[PDB]
């Protein structure tokens, strides 16, 4: 998996193709199902606390 | 019923006015069967040969009531002329006199703002808001006939 | 109405299978295939088993199936003559869709292909069609061109201000909330 | 007296309309 | 004690899976000759309703619950000598070795509540910590996967002063276990490292074992620049898997593109994730993942390869390949596109966006449905 | 006819009034938490 | 000590009526309902004796079936005479309840009288007799729209999609929907109702788009005691994701309880998830009794096509070309001439965009336009995702709306 490049079965045709992009979309994401799971935990723990 | 407006487009015209009653006895059942048929209904009020006239205007104004339309509803029952009664006691009659006397203020409030435009007031909303006024003071409510009037701006019914 | 709440009031017609089948033949000319499928819901399990009704049902298998050599052999066992109105214009709705079809999907067809597609019996037939509903095709050296649209089954192929301004719409209409 | 609860009713209601344009003009002044 | 747990749960759970292990016999009879030994009386109950009648069990209890009481009493002969002259709690300070007894013996109620009081006893956290192992181990047992979450972070708040590293990478194996156990294989691959520095267990003697179970995970959750650190890892198999002949010959079949055997020791690999425990309840999840990384490895190494070459070098049945390409494909990975009649398969290279777009598309839709939802719960 | 025709719109009245009465105080409140 | 309960619920409606708290009353209920597995005949008796004077026209007229308090008896009674089977006598009482409903002219009436609506019609599905409610209850919602009475407009309402969509006068569901003015969400369970009463007739009217938001929206508010409810705005969710061509996830074929109720559905779309009609036909035959049950057969028939597109999903995909014969044998169609309609299946694929793909019958063979790395997924990715963040931004300011700070 070092430096790209993928030659054809037997025709010569290399097959590298890619693209340097760091996307803020992945890492947001991330951010948003954390968030979102602990917004679930303190909706819960304030339902029992409703319920109490 | 897709029956009775099934007997609406024959050419007996009789028969088309009597299936029209037999929709308006059951008018408050049947409102959404005959909503997608008011076309039909609005083209035998629209046409002067037929002596029935009122009844399917009745119906209309009937339809658009439980449509939730009162404009309609009252424009089609000033067209029904003399078999909209004031004096039955239906929820149908009274929210339509209730919308008839507020649109009438509206209509005598606004002709006397326009010095310069009579807005045409019709002659059948002016003979309801009549019988309305005279059924408050044969029932002995002077002091609702009173506000009326005084709403209404009509002065001669108020000092009768 | 009679059908729906008269019928526990009224001995079963004979003529109500054949005109519910005829009815739901021409929902399916009219492409109201949702009516369609309402009223065979509304229809009971031995009214289904009707040859007319049954008929109808088998013709709307073939027009959903796409076989509409199936629709056009069928028109010859039509039950009853007063269908024979409808399975035409069932015909013509088909042939209608069947070239809508061929347009998108090839560039160009052979004369002889667009015929057998389309089940005319002479190349004057053919011809006819295509002067007539369709002036858009283009006949050179024996083949059918179909004009395809400039852009269409492409993806990402649409007009790029708009979608922009769409963007628009969304962003200012969002913040002056804010 | 009958008429009156209704006429009284519309003269509150009338003169808490107008509450809307005086709460208005504070939440800007605020 | 809960260090032979092991013995307990594994046998019993080996017992109870895969079909009750072909014809189910000479598991009931070694898990009872550890039974109705060593004061068992709790756990086994509708291990005996699984099990045959076994009549006359009756004297077989009422031998060891005066066992129980023994031992029990005692405890009671204890607690009012040593609280006349108090040492540390002495009372609390003999059962708090004694309540693991109770909880080998007994169930988690006479654990849980002289825990939680032992737990208030000691000022230094080399007795409170061995007790959260104890929770742990315990919550595994009756899958206490609600009370793991809770001691887990309740253990790691305690490490942090010291530096305890008997503490920390005996613990890092828990989560370990943890993380492979439910589907969670990325973190199997993190107590690799911490496996090669580990040591063997009651549970995990053999070296060799612990060391074979962390090539298992490592090859799903690295690639193979991380499995050129995986070869770094097979030097450290000519160590522990150099004894291996097995798993020797099955990973490297994977690095030396030996592709033809690397499905047959698959076979055995798959058979006996079958009848082991804790990956019966995720076996045909692995081979489906080990499949579609032997099969896209091949793949990428050309622009397109014919369909009839890789049944004789890869793996026997060209239509075998051809049905299972087709739903690889159909199920959204493993980027090619094969065509049919003129006999050939074809790749392409898309761009690490459209991929990277659908998992967002999937979370931001799971998060709106967790808040939507709980919006309306509360708040009437 | 006066029952069906001046008495109803004491039961309309009162029905505007009361929503209005709350959306005035919950705009009051607002603005007063500031104001303070 | 049920009683007690009885007269404890008694003080407490009477509590609610002089301090004229709807949710005093709804306390009461909650223990009324409380206390329906204990209801007994003598205590039934002793508790109208004790709240009705012996004499009362409408004491004498509830012992012969055995206005807040006189209304409330009749609500017992009637779940009891359900409790005991006797529909017939609580039609009468439904109706005798309900009567004397009409000339009580007092506000405090609706959630009592709500109830009642609620209990009336049910004696009525139980004798068959749904259809002579459709001249009772109308003009009894008429008088709650009359009233304003907004907890009566709505109970009334659902009730008469209910009716309607019960003798299917699906024809007439969809009037009532585009009349019945927008009540506000007073009722958690109703409004789902009219929440699902809707996301039933949207799946049946076509209108999926609004009919999953709508089956999702009663779902969304499913109270978790009605699974039956959850189960029932879960399984017309599931048709409708199937009937959409995105198929639920199998998370919600495992929640708790409810797993008995969906087992039906979950085959149906593993069948439509691997595109095959064949265990279709399997599926749909064996639980095709349990189907009947439901009543969404009608959206079953629709499925194969989606089924057929399903199956059309994996080949494209799954498949760059291959002849049109291959089509419709791994679509195992026991068409007589599977050659003309997989044929004719791709034209109307083609047609319907379901494939990039393109069609060669000079060669009888199928061209799946290059359906893997293709070019940008935005535009509609682009489009897609902001009806979604702009879902939430009237969503968030939904929350800041109800921001009180």
Known sequence: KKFAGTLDQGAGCLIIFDDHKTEDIYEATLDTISNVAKVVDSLFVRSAKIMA | ?160 | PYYTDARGRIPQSTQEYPILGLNLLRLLVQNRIAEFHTELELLSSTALENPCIKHAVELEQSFMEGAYNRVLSARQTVPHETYVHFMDLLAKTVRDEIAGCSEKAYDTLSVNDARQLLLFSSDKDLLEYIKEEHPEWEIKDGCVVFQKSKDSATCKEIPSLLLINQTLSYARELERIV | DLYGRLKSLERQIEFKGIQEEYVKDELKNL | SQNEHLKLANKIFHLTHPDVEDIEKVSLKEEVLSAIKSDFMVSLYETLAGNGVLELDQALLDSMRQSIEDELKKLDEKIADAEENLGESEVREAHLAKSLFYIRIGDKDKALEQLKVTETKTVAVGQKMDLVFFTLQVGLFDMDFDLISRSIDKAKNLFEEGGDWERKNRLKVYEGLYCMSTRDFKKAASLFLDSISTFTTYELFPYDTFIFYTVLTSIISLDRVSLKQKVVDAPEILTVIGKIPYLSEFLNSLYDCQYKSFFSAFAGLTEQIKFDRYLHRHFRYYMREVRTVVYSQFLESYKSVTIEAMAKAFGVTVEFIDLELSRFIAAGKLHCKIDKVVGVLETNRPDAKNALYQATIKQGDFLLNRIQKLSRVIDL | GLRQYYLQHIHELQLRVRNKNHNLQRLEAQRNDLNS | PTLKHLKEIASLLETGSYTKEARRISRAIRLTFAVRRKLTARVLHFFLDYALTPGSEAHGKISAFLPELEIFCYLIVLLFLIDQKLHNEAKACASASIARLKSLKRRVADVLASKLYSFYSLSYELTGDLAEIRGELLTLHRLTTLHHDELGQETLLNLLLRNYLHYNLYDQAEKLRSKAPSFGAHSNQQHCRHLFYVGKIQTIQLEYTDAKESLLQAARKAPIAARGFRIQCNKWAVIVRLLLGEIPERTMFMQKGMEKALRPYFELTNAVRIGDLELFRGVTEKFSSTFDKDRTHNLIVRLRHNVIRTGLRNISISYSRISLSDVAKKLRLDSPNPVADAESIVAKAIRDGAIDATLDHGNGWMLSKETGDIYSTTEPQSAFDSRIAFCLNMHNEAVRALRYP
């Open chain 2, 1 to 160: 019923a897709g029956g009775m407006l099934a007997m609406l487009s024959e050419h007996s015209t009789s028969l088309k006015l009597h299936a029209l009653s037999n929709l308006n006895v059951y008018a408050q059942f049947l409102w959404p069967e005959i909503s997608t048929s008011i076309p039909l209904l609005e083209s035998l009020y629209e046409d002067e040969e037929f002596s029935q006239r009122p009844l399917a205007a009745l119906v209309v104004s009937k339809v658009f009531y439980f449509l939730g339309e009162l404009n309609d509803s009252l424009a089609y029952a000033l067209g029904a002329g003399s078999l909209f009664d004031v004096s039955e006691d239906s929820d149908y009659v009274r929210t339509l006199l209730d919308k008839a006397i507020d649109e009438y203020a509206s209509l005598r409030n606004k002709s006397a703002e326009s010095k310069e435009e009579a807005v045409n007031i019709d002659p059948r909303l002016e003979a309801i808001v009549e019988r309305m006024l005279e059924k408050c003071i044969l029932d002995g409510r002077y002091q609702q006939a009173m506000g009326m009037a005084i709403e209404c701006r009509r002065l001669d019914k108020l000092e009768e």
